[PDB]
Structures are given as C-alpha cells and as structure tokens.
Design a protein around this ligand. Structure first.
Ligand code: HEM
Length: 395
C-alpha cells in the first residue's frame, strides 16, 4: 500500500518507503513544499547519476536558453555548487590542505573534546544525547580544524547552531553575515600570524602559475566546511549510537572487540545514511533512468539512504552487520564532489561513538523507538533529540 513520502510516517522510519520506491517507483517526482524534485532510489542509478555529465550543479539549467545572459554561476562561490572546470580548480586548491597528517593531528583534539563532554554527563538523567553530545562535537572539531581562537568558540558555536535551525530563517540569513565577517577578519589574523591550522594553510595555497584562493573564495570555502561538516557529522553520531542501542548483538560484538569501530562506522553510514539524499542536481538535458525520463531543467535528488540498502548491491541490506564490508556505499557521494571531509567525518564518528560506548557501557534509550522524533528536513536523517540514561562510567 502507499507509504507516506517526506510526510507522515516517513520521518520516523523512511526505510520501508525507500524499499517500495526501489521496487515499484525508482524514479519518482516528489511534490515537496518549495517545489517538485525527482528522486532516484536504486543503487545502480544513483551511482550512474553521480557521474552523469548531464546532471549539473549549475542552477541556470532551470532557465530556458533565452533567459541565461545575466546569470551568475553560483549565489556564493561554493565549490559544491559548481561544475568543472571551475569546480576542478577549487577542489585542487582546497584539497592540498586536507592532508593525512592534518587529520591524524586532529585525533587527540577530537578525543579531548569528546572526553570533556562525557565527563560532564550524569549517570541517571535522562539526558538528550543530541543536544548534550552529538550537537557539540562537530562544531568544536571545525573550530579546531580551522584555528578559531578558543575565546571565539562559544560565540562561533552559538551562531553555528542558528544555521542549524533554532528559530526562523530570517536569523540564519544574518548569522551568515556574522560568520562571514568573523571569518573574513580571522583570515587577516592568520595572514599576519601563520599557524598550523586550516585557514592559515588555505592562504598559502598557490599552484605553479601562482594561482590561489581569492579573499571571497577563502571565506566561501570556510563557510562551506562549517555547513557541510556540522549537521552531517552530528547525525552520523546520533544515527550510529541509535543503531547500537537498537541492536544488542552488534553492540556486544563491538564491546568484545573495540577495534571493530572503524568497520562499525562504515556500516552505520550505510544502514542509516545521515545525508539521506544528495543535494540537488539539475538536468542539463533529458535523462532516462530505469526507463523513466526526467525532462531538461528539472531538479534531481539522489537517494543515498535508499541506495545504501539496495539488495541488488548489498545482500541482507536491512541487517546491521558491523563486520560487513563497507565497499561502494554512496553515503559520502561518488565522483568529483565526493565528500572532502570523509576522513575527518570517519575520525569524528569513531572517536565520538567509540569513546561513548567505552565510557558508558550501560547506555540505554530512555524512550521507545516509536517515540523518537526526527527532523523534517528533506536531505537529512537526523534525530531532533535522543532521550537516554547514560548509566555508570566504566570501571
Ligand atoms: C559527517 C558525515 C558527512 C557526510 C555523510 C557527508 C556527505 C557528503 C556528500 C554525500 C557529499 C557530496 C554531495 C553531492 O555530490 O551532491 C559531500 C560533499 C562535501 N562534503 Fe561532506 N559529509 C560529511 C561530513 C563532512 C565534513 C566533516 C566536512 C568538512 C570538514 C565535509 C565537507 C564537504 C565538502 C567541502 C563537500 C563538497 C565537495 C565538492 O563539491 O567537491 N563533509 N559530503
């Protein structure tokens, strides 16, 4: 029978809806509030679509040919909203700074951030694990990555939460201006006073033809990292913790062998992908997937959460198996826009989740599954809150 889509029963558990879509309606127009968008749910179609040159990030394909003259490529020069060759240049410049060592160097800091939060949580609560733990880690990590002065952090975090929906969308519109101004000035302090962190690194960036990020590009890139790395990581933590709380068997396996945490994080990303659909693509011309044709100029979402449970890709896809092999999941995307932060996200997930279950072996949900409340956000699989009882700290 007809499962609700992006409404009703869908928000608490969209997986049955996605399974029915993959089986019966794999390429489907969705009447979303701000406008209709097409959804692809089969793994093979999603994978193809990510490398389909006819599926663009350039919103100007929504305009008929005669209306394009005046029009800018992007509303903000963010690399995620570009096609090659412009994307290729920004990806080359920023990518330089995302070194293996920079990631390894962050691990002790992420560990300290997690331990600091864990220390302040009570044994008997109940406590909202989202507000109190998952929400805090990723922005504190972004602060560390970028080199936001520790005095400016609680302020930085404050305006960051405003971007992750506190009140109406009037304030975010100006919170961007605050973060833009703040980052703009910080970049100046880094220029005068180089440090080992990312903002400083991004200024040095210079290819042999002398190329470098403009002042405008630098701030847009920093804002992109904040936005791309905050809510996403929060939901990796929230969703992975929930997966363990709801699968006693897998939780036992991890407890007996803590080294499974890396494999576990890959499986959480597959089993309940936090970026549930990829951000919109635009058809540059008509495309046909699973015999269904999407006209030129349309908006298209790639169903990552749906694709990651496609049995044509992964056998027993509805089973959580933290020993499973990750291979080929689409939770970080695929092709040219593949998540720049994937290594950092994976690090944050394994520290946040691994340390929590190590610190609090008797952690338990304090409500029934049917009582969990998810954010009604098209591209997000995210708990609004997670009531838990932390239980005693491990011996
Ligand atoms: C925590 C879990 C995360 C998930 C599931 C995730 C997922 C994704 C996905 C699916 C894409 C590609 C979107 C598309 O092709 O339309 C992407 C791109 C991107 N992500 Fe992540 N992300 C995560 C964390 C992060 C973090 C921590 C950072 C930075 C520290 C980051 C930075 C970026 C950037 C800059 C892009 C754009 C890359 C490009 O356009 O070339 N992400 N992410």
């Amino acid at each position: 029978e007809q499962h609700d889509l992006f409404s009703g029963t869908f928000w608490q558990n969209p997986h049955p809806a996605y399974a029915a879509l993959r089986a019966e309606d794999p390429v489907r127009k969705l009447a979303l509030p701000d406008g209709p968008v097409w959804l692809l749910t089969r793994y093979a179609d999603v994978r193809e679509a990510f490398v389909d040159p006819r599926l663009s990030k350039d919103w100007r394909h929504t305009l008929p040919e005669d209306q394009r003259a005046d029009m800018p490529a992007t509303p903000t020069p963010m690399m995620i909203l570009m096609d090659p060759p412009d994307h290729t240049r920004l990806r080359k410049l920023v990518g330089r700074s995302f070194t293996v060592r920079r990631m390894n160097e962050l691990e002790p800091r992420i560990t300290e951030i997690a331990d600091g939060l864990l220390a302040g949580l009570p044994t008997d609560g109940p406590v909202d694990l989202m507000r109190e733990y998952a929400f805090q880690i990723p922005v504190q990590v972004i602060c560390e990555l970028l080199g936001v002065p520790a005095e400016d952090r609680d302020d930085f975090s404050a305006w960051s939460s405003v971007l992750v929906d506190d009140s109406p969308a009037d304030d975010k519109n100006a919170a961007m201006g605050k973060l833009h101004g703040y980052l703009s000035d910080l970049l100046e302090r880094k220029r005068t006073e180089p440090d080992d962190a990312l903002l400083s690194s991004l200024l040095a960036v210079s290819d042999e033809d002398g190329d470098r990020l403009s002042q405008e590009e630098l701030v847009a890139m920093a804002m992109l990292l904040l936005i791309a790395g905050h809510e996403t990581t929060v939901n990796l933590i929230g969703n992975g913790v929930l997966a363990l709380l709801t699968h006693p068997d897998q939780r036992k396996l991890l407890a007996e062998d803590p080294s499974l945490i890396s494999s576990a994080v890959e499986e959480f990303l597959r089993f309940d992908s936090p970026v549930s659909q990829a951000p919109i693509r635009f058809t540059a011309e008509d495309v046909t997937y699973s015999g269904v044709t999407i006209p030129a100029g349309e908006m298209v979402m790639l169903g990552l959460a749906a694709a990651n449970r496609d049995a044509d890709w992964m056998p027993e896809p509805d089973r959580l198996d933290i020993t499973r092999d990750a291979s080929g999941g689409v939770f970080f995307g695929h092709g040219i826009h593949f998540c720049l932060g994937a290594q950092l996200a994976r690090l944050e997930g394994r520290v946040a989740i691994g340390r929590l279950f190590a610190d609090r072996p008797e952690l338990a949900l304090a409500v029934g599954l049917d009582e969990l409340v998810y954010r009604e956000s098209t591209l997000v699989r995210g708990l609004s809150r997670m009531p838990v009882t932390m239980g005693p700290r491990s011996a």
